[PDB]
Amino acid sequence: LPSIQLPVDYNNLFNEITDFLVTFKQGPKYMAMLQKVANRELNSVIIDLDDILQYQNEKFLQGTQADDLVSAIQQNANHFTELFCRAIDNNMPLPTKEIDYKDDVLDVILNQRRLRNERMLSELFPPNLTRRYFLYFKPLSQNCAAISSKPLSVRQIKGDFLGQLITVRGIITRVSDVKPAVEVIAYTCDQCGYEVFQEVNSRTFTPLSECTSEECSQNQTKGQLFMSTRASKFSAFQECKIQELSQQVPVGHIPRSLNIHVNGTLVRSLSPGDIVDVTGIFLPAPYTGFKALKAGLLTETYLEAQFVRQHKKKFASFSLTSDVEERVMELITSGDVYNRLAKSIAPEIYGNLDVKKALLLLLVGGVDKRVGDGMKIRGDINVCLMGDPGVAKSQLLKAICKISPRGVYTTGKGSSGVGLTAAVMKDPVTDEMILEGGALVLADNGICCIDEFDKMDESDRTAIHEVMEQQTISISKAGINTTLNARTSILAAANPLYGRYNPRLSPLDNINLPAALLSRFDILFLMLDIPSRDDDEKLAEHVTYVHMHNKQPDLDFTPVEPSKMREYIAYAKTKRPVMSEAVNDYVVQAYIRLRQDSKREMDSKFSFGQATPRTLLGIIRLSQALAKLRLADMVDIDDVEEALRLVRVSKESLYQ
Amino acid sequence: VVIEAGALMLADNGICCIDEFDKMDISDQVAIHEAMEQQTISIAKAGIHATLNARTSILAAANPVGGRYNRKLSLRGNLNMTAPIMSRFDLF
Amino acid sequence: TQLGLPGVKPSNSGVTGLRSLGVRDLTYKISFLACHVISIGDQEVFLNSLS
Amino acid sequence: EIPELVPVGEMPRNLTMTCDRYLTNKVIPGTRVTIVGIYSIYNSGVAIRTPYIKILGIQSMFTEEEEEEFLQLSRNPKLYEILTNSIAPSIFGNEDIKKAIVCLLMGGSKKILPDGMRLRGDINVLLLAKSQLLKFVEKVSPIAVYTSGKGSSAAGLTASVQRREFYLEGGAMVLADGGVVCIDEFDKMRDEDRVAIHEAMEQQTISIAKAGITTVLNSRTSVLAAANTTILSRFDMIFIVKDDHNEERDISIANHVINIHTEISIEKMKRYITYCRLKCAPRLSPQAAEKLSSNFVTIRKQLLINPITIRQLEAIIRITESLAKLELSPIAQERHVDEAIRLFQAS
Amino acid sequence: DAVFGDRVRRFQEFLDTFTSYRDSVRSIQVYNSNNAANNILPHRIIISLDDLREFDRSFWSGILVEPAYFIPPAEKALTDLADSMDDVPHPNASAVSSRHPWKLSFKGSFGAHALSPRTLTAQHLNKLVSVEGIVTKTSLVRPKLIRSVHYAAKTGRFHYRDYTDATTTLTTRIPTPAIYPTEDTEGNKLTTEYGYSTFIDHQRITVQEMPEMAPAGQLPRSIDVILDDDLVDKTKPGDRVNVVGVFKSLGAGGMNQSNSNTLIGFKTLILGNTVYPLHAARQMLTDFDIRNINKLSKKKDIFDILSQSLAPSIYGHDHIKKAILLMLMGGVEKNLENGSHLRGDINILMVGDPSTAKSQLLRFVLNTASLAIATTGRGSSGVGLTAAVTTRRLEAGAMVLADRGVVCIDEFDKMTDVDRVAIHEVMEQQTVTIAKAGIHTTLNARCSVIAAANPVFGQYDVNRDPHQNIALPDSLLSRFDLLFVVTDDINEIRDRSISEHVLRTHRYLPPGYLEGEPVPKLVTIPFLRKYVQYAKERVIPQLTQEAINVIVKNYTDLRNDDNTKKSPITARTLETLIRLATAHAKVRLSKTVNKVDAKVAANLLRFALLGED
Amino acid sequence: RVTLQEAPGTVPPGRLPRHREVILLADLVDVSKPGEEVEVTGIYKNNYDGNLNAKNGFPVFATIIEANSIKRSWTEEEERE
DNA sequence: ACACACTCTCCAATTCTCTAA
DNA sequence: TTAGAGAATTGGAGAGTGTGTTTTTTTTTTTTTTT
Ligand SMILES: Nc1ncnc2c1ncn2[C@@H]1O[C@H](COP(=O)(O)OP(=O)(O)NP(=O)(O)O)[C@@H](O)[C@H]1O
Ligand SMILES: Nc1ncnc2c1ncn2[C@@H]1O[C@H](COP(=O)(O)OP(=O)(O)NP(=O)(O)O)[C@@H](O)[C@H]1O
Ligand SMILES: [Mg+2]
Numbered sequence A: 001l002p003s004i005q006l007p008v009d010y011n012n013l014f015n016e017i018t019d020f021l022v023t024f025k026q027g028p029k030y031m032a033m034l035q036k037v038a039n040r041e042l043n044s045v046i047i048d049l050d051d052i053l054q055y056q057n058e059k060f061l062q063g064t065q066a067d068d069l070v071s072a073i074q075q076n077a078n079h080f081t082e083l084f085c086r087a088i089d090n091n092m093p094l095p096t097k098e099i100d101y102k103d104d105v106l107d108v109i110l111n112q113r114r115l116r117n118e119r120m121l122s123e124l125f126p127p128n129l130t131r132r133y134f135l136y137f138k139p140l141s142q143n144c145a146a147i148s149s150k151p152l153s154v155r156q157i158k159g160d161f162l163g164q165l166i167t168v169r170g171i172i173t174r175v176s177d178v179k180p181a182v183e184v185i186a187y188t189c190d191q192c193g194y195e196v197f198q199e200v201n202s203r204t205f206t207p208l209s210e211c212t213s214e215e216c217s218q219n220q221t222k223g224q225l226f227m228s229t230r231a232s233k234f235s236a237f238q239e240c241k242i243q244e245l246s247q248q249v250p251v252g253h254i255p256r257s258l259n260i261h262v263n264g265t266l267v268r269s270l271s272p273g274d275i276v277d278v279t280g281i282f283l284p285a286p287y288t289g290f291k292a293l294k295a296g297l298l299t300e301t302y303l304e305a306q307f308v309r310q311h312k313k314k315f316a317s318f319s320l321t322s323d324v325e326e327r328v329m330e331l332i333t334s335g336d337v338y339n340r341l342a343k344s345i346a347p348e349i350y351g352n353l354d355v356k357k358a359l360l361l362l363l364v365g366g367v368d369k370r371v372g373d374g375m376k377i378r379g380d381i382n383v384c385l386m387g388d389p390g391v392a393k394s395q396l397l398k399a400i401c402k403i404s405p406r407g408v409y410t411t412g413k414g415s416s417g418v419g420l421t422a423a424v425m426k427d428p429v430t431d432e433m434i435l436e437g438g439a440l441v442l443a444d445n446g447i448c449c450i451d452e453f454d455k456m457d458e459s460d461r462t463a464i465h466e467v468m469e470q471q472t473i474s475i476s477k478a479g480i481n482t483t484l485n486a487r488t489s490i491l492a493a494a495n496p497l498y499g500r501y502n503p504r505l506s507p508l509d510n511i512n513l514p515a516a517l518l519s520r521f522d523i524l525f526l527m528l529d530i531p532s533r534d535d536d537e538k539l540a541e542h543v544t545y546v547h548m549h550n551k552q553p554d555l556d557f558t559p560v561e562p563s564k565m566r567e568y569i570a571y572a573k574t575k576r577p578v579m580s581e582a583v584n585d586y587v588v589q590a591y592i593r594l595r596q597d598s599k600r601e602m603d604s605k606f607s608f609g610q611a612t613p614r615t616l617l618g619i620i621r622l623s624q625a626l627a628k629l630r631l632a633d634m635v636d637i638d639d640v641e642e643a644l645r646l647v648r649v650s651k652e653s654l655y656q
Numbered sequence B: 001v002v003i004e005a006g007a008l009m010l011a012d013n014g015i016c017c018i019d020e021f022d023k024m025d026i027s028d029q030v031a032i033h034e035a036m037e038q039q040t041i042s043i044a045k046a047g048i049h050a051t052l053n054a055r056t057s058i059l060a061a062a063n064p065v066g067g068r069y070n071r072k073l074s075l076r077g078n079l080n081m082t083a084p085i086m087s088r089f090d091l092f
Numbered sequence C: 001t002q003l004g005l006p007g008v009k010p011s012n013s014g015v016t017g018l019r020s021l022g023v024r025d026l027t028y029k030i031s032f033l034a035c036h037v038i039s040i041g042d043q044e045v046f047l048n049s050l051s
Numbered sequence D: 001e002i003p004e005l006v007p008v009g010e011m012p013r014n015l016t017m018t019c020d021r022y023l024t025n026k027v028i029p030g031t032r033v034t035i036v037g038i039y040s041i042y043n044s045g046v047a048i049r050t051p052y053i054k055i056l057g058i059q060s061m062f063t064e065e066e067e068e069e070f071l072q073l074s075r076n077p078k079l080y081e082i083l084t085n086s087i088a089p090s091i092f093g094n095e096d097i098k099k100a101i102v103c104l105l106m107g108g109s110k111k112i113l114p115d116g117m118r119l120r121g122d123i124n125v126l127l128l129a130k131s132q133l134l135k136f137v138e139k140v141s142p143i144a145v146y147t148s149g150k151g152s153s154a155a156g157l158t159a160s161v162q163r164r165e166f167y168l169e170g171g172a173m174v175l176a177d178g179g180v181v182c183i184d185e186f187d188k189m190r191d192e193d194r195v196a197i198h199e200a201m202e203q204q205t206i207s208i209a210k211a212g213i214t215t216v217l218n219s220r221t222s223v224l225a226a227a228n229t230t231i232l233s234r235f236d237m238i239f240i241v242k243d244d245h246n247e248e249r250d251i252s253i254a255n256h257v258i259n260i261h262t263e264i265s266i267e268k269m270k271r272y273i274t275y276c277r278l279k280c281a282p283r284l285s286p287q288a289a290e291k292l293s294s295n296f297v298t299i300r301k302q303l304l305i306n307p308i309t310i311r312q313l314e315a316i317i318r319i320t321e322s323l324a325k326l327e328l329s330p331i332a333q334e335r336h337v338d339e340a341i342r343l344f345q346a347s
Numbered sequence E: 001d002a003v004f005g006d007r008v009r010r011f012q013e014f015l016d017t018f019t020s021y022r023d024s025v026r027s028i029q030v031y032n033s034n035n036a037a038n039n040i041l042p043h044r045i046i047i048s049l050d051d052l053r054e055f056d057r058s059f060w061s062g063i064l065v066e067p068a069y070f071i072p073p074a075e076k077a078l079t080d081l082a083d084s085m086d087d088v089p090h091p092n093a094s095a096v097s098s099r100h101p102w103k104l105s106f107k108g109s110f111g112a113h114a115l116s117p118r119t120l121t122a123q124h125l126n127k128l129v130s131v132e133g134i135v136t137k138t139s140l141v142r143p144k145l146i147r148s149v150h151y152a153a154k155t156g157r158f159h160y161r162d163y164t165d166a167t168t169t170l171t172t173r174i175p176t177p178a179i180y181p182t183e184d185t186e187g188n189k190l191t192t193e194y195g196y197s198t199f200i201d202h203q204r205i206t207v208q209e210m211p212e213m214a215p216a217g218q219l220p221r222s223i224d225v226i227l228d229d230d231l232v233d234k235t236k237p238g239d240r241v242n243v244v245g246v247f248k249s250l251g252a253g254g255m256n257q258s259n260s261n262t263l264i265g266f267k268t269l270i271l272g273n274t275v276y277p278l279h280a281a282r283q284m285l286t287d288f289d290i291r292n293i294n295k296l297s298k299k300k301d302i303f304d305i306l307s308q309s310l311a312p313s314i315y316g317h318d319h320i321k322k323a324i325l326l327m328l329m330g331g332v333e334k335n336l337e338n339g340s341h342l343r344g345d346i347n348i349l350m351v352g353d354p355s356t357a358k359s360q361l362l363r364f365v366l367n368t369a370s371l372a373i374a375t376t377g378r379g380s381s382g383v384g385l386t387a388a389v390t391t392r393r394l395e396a397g398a399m400v401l402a403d404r405g406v407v408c409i410d411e412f413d414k415m416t417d418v419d420r421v422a423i424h425e426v427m428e429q430q431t432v433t434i435a436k437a438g439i440h441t442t443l444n445a446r447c448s449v450i451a452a453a454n455p456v457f458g459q460y461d462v463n464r465d466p467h468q469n470i471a472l473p474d475s476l477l478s479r480f481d482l483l484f485v486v487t488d489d490i491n492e493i494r495d496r497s498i499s500e501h502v503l504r505t506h507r508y509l510p511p512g513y514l515e516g517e518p519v520p521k522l523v524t525i526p527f528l529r530k531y532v533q534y535a536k537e538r539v540i541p542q543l544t545q546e547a548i549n550v551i552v553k554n555y556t557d558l559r560n561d562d563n564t565k566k567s568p569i570t571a572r573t574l575e576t577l578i579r580l581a582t583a584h585a586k587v588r589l590s591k592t593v594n595k596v597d598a599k600v601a602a603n604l605l606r607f608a609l610l611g612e613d
Numbered sequence F: 001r002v003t004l005q006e007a008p009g010t011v012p013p014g015r016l017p018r019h020r021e022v023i024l025l026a027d028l029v030d031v032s033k034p035g036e037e038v039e040v041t042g043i044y045k046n047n048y049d050g051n052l053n054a055k056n057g058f059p060v061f062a063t064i065i066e067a068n069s070i071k072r073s074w075t076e077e078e079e080r081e
Numbered sequence G: 001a002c003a004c005a006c007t008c009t010c011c012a013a014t015t016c017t018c019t020a021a
Numbered sequence H: 001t002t003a004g005a006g007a008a009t010t011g012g013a014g015a016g017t018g019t020g021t022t023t024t025t026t027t028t029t030t031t032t033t034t035t
């Protein structure tokens, strides 16, 4: 009933919008996009606010006043999706290329309806019915920066923000599958042969049942309406849920969450388990009908997704733009990438170079193989660390946990074999049974870190057997009978029996693992803590420097940062180098020597069990990883001898 | 309760066959023992009470412990069956 | 339930448009309406029974 | 309905009723009452309604002259003998047992220091015929709990966690907080209680961190126990019951049994104990301090040339204070120290 | 209607007379205006009710007995005062029509209206009351609509309307249907302007009488409270709290036609006006405390004074007291740029004979640390001590609850092997991670551990190896910074000294009591707690070359020289030396670690490790 | 109201027992206790029930028994004996 | 307050009848 | 034989009124404390 004044007039902002769309350039930027839309080549338009800020600054420097459109569309973001759409419809250019227009049902229907009106004469339909595109905003760059650039945790999203454009940081919990949603519905009248339309915005609607057309009425033609799919307009819909990071939850509280909606080409971007920076519009969800009359003033709310930023680029997302080419060429021209990359892993930990090189080869990994008859062979590499208490095992493990884009960290005592692999939970109230994967499924196509491997129960460790070699899970329980995919590499750490390594017994007594599980690791590294007045002094000096300065001590060596390391590793995981006959003869001859030496010394104190056929493919996998890191397309004997050395060095700790 | 009849009710005035008796849980062996003692079944739960007749003769099969009989030992030693249930078979 | 049963409120798609249904929807179930049953599972009475 | 009016073999019937204004908050559960009210029905079959009643009426520290008697008792020169004689008079002999029970009932004095440390007041005794004394202690004590070693539930003596969500319940050490507790067979203690009674006795607390539960429970009580090892160290005094077999005693008991089949009284003594507990909390004199320290070092030197420890000196102090408590003397003296070390001969 | 204006005038006179409330308004306004140009303080003020009594009794009793008729006009007058004072020009669209007035709160001298949930009675309805109890439940936060703004497409006019509900206002009005208008009076189609509309936060809680006051094992009683705007989420379950607000009723009570025959009563609530906690830990320093703390720090031997002031009632064990003080100060936690983490907190273990004050000394830390949790070794399981699953929801254990604090474990030897191994992560990585059916999460646990144990043979046997006497794995003993062995050696003068000491202790009498009634220099513990708080917050000593020169030499000599040392020596020993030096420098309130601190830390570690100085 | 069930001795072999419900009015209330074996005389009566018709899908009426009567010391000679 | 089921009322569309050219 | 003026019977347009709606097992997988 009452009314107020406000400082904003939308006519001026509309004029600013139509000038911005036709003038700005980094021809003008957005007219190219609209030409692509007119040609039916492009489905969505992404508006940058950095462009609007730049446009405002340039117009100001030319000596003219201008409204601050950036804050205007951040404050009340919902209204401006309509203004931009109307501006785009007004200014849309004509097509550059032939289209085959007859493929469109709506074109035929509207042309015939226009012809009917033309003959009769001897808005028509809602404009939403013919918008072939979607539109989204992208927030301000923080380095140019405003609230939309500064992430909020899910607790900080108060009721003040309803209607604004914001950014949220958290973990996704669940994702729904896609289903259609109506925007404009179409009908047909049987008797008078005329079509009518209806637009839907709310969650529910009442369909039409009477032809209220004036011509149909004046003929007293009380015809019947029927719905039609063939001329209705749908749009893809998907719903998700986001939840705050566990390490940001205050003490004694339960984590909170938000509901996210996604429409258009943005669909099926999110996935469960992702750490992500979502940005969108935060809105309420009103009730409808009789429910509204007695629901009260408490409003449900959700977030309209607009743009998504992931923290870590998955390896599958790689493509060699020249920007990445320029940076990998730095490492390629500098040379000796193997040693530099190995040294760069956890610079704050002294020594341990061979272990780091092995873990780099874990990060790269071998080549998948699939024989013509259907047999397939594992590509992943498995590694284990066995050593005395207090030699930076857990520290180095958790350091590698950072580099990998997909990865999880787990400890032996806190883990169930079910939850480590997959569980059949009677979760809903409806007594339904549903499968939900465990840690090794979440680490699919990634690394799984299992600390305190010796404390895990003997029965539960047997669950890992299938996943290690076959890279799959099989379950046959109540109401569920399926197989899941787990293409994960395992890294594990443990102390020997009795804690500190006992020289009185053989290595196999100290290791205390069964044969079937000991074989499944490609490398098992044995590291012992033996005092030495010379070495302890150097280690103490290094650690004291690190505690003093927060920086590793350095005179010659500069580590590569993790981002460039990730780029180089991602580029290296695409090569698939092949073997050759000369290399094949060499490795074939080595394998015989290994098994003969194993047979000679099964009785000996220097025994480590018997070499199985799985030790040959370990050599091949390590050789192919080394071939990958030098960006070759051909395995070389140089790689093979290095692979053999890296396997030999693991046992030298036994000899003081 | 669903009340619907069990196996012993269907075998009233008949032969009830139990195969691999030794694998049955003790918590159910006691139920068969209680029914066999009286030839009667009782229900009392959720406000519903009932008594039913179970005039059924039992024929059972079992495995010796360890899979092979021991001639050195009594049948009680060989068989994983409690003494009250063993006392109520006419023939072994 | 979907028909005008006195004293009870209404409760894969059915059929509609009938007078009694209004805007409601009606489905059906299959069952068998039998007419007789036959099973196939004192000594004097027994002897009289035999041929 | 009244328990002595129900027909045999039936569960008792009951009614629901209402009251307002001054008739509210006038009664508590378990009390026998008489009621006047209108009997009527209310809505909540066919043409059927529930009955109820509207109520219109319901029916259901010391003086000076008391403490004068207690003061007269306090100045009697043979009060200790009188109180010992009054405890389980039917039981023959066992003088030191009765003296120890007097000391257990009276207790020491609680203290709190500037740095926050807290000093215990309670007394603990073990007895190795014996069934009667625990019942007597239950009757005479102001507050008392009686139990056998297995306890009233799965909580046992101390406490346990049970399960469906988990919960926690306390045994007959938490429930007796602030009073006395007597255990009928200490050897039948369960496995968890064997370890938990260490904290229950030394700290006067029970603490649990299991299945997401994280709480601490109060166990401020004096324990009497009997049985028939290292667990004897927790008690302040231990003794073994002794018997005598006079035929006249048994004949007298039998004659009394036939009579039912065909010195200070309990209530007065209980009230006197309550008064003494409320009014006085004495302190050691310096002479007692010198005496006790000299005796302590003497015993340790004698054992060395041939163990006593501070945890037993602090028990002797509590026994001394409890002995001084009877006279209502504000200071303890060498008279009490001598009787304390004399009674300390558990062995 | 006219009476509303006069009450506004009278409260305006009150606000002009007592000027200390004008300063509050202006200070909040200028603070908010400053940072806006770059957190924001609420538009709320607390008034002393005694000032209102002394100014005008009629207004005081009107507020205190008829709040629905007196609180709104006073709040209106406060909003007028704050609005007339100068404010930033050119407000934005949302600021122009916020519908956000200032709000009041009260303190002091409620008299008869100070109550508890048991005694709150129907006579007190519509009065302003204060209650005390424990929070038991809290609802989720929800937004609530109070105003909406609309833009008319054709005319270019902005319209608006307001909404009300029974819990939003002290006075009573016709309820509103929560419908958004779609069309203008003149037929123009409307659009809703989110971001110009106003929503507020809402939360319900429940408060119960304290268990200490429950009679006869009877059922306890409780009340529901309503909170909104600034008061949301300032409490959690288990908090002891004192709440101020108006006690009111709601609803039709079944007189709108119902089957109950109106035997059921009306609903009731307290509308939260102000909330205060109860101490049942933290202290705030005054200027005099800063002066005294800085002046005391320049004594030659502050470490001896402070260490000997810890548990003066316990004779002897100087080194353990000094170690406990250094534990309470702690080191400095490091986070390197690549995300790597280096531990800072110190763990201590002590094992010894019976009766040698292990539990008594362990009890002292529980009553001087700001956050402390205590447990017995056999009364706790691994999942209970770290974390557990429930319903999926994950529930924290004891080590997770004490995050930045200390945890005390008595009877450590009785803990089973299956329970102990859960602790190996928490004492170095300072995190708890679970991987069970339907859950995978990581939790933080940054605490320091102090614990006590008994030797294997019941008393320490010098004639057997320390490993034989101490049945724990080497990987666990490595995680304790300092391991102390203590015994009850019989000696004449030692026994005499200890016995005389405890006898002197037992002759204490508190100040306010006559004899027989039932209940160097040492700084007081209430001052020592302030000293520890100030030193832990305000000074962060950085390391120096001169300290490093000592640390490296001591480490390399201690590791390599062959001796009968009683603990394994590893890379964690160097960290122990660095932590102890940093903590001792922190006791000194030095901005940097010096040679003296490293020397003292080495001398303490040598005593604990090699058993002799 | 009282629920009445067939005595186990009367039930034929291999069949479950049947049930009926009895209404007791003014003088007859609390004449019998649970578990007793009882004999009843009364009128057999029926009425419409919507839920039965809805669930079964046939015009099926429910039936009740209205009881009219319900059925389940020494002399000097015994004392002298 | 928002779709439905059911009731009530008035008005004009329609057919039937009579009269005269 | 057409047609036009007057009367009687019927249909359904449409206006009105009242109404209803939100809201003890038994079997099977998994974690936890208890003997
Ligand atoms: N070469 C090294 N460089 C730097 N720090 C080291 C080195 N070796 C050991 N440390 C330190 O040793 C400490 C313990 O490391 P950690 O990874 O927990 O050892 P661990 O072998 O896993 N101990 P445990 O789990 O008992 O076997 C950390 O503070 C490391 O900084
Ligand atoms: N200076 C002291 N030295 C030893 N004990 C003392 C000292 N001062 C007091 N005590 C008393 O000694 C008793 C034993 O203390 P406590 O802390 O329980 O020893 P403990 O090491 O825990 N024995 P335990 O529980 O078997 O491991 C308490 O009653 C203390 O009051
Ligand atoms: Mg480790």
Ligand SMILES: [Mg+2]
Residues within 6 Å of the ligand: D202, E355, E358, E359, E360
């Ligand atoms: Mg102790």
Ligand SMILES: [Zn+2]
Residues within 6 Å of the ligand: A189, A190, A191, A192, A193, A194, A211, A213, A216, A221, A223
């Ligand atoms: Zn039509």
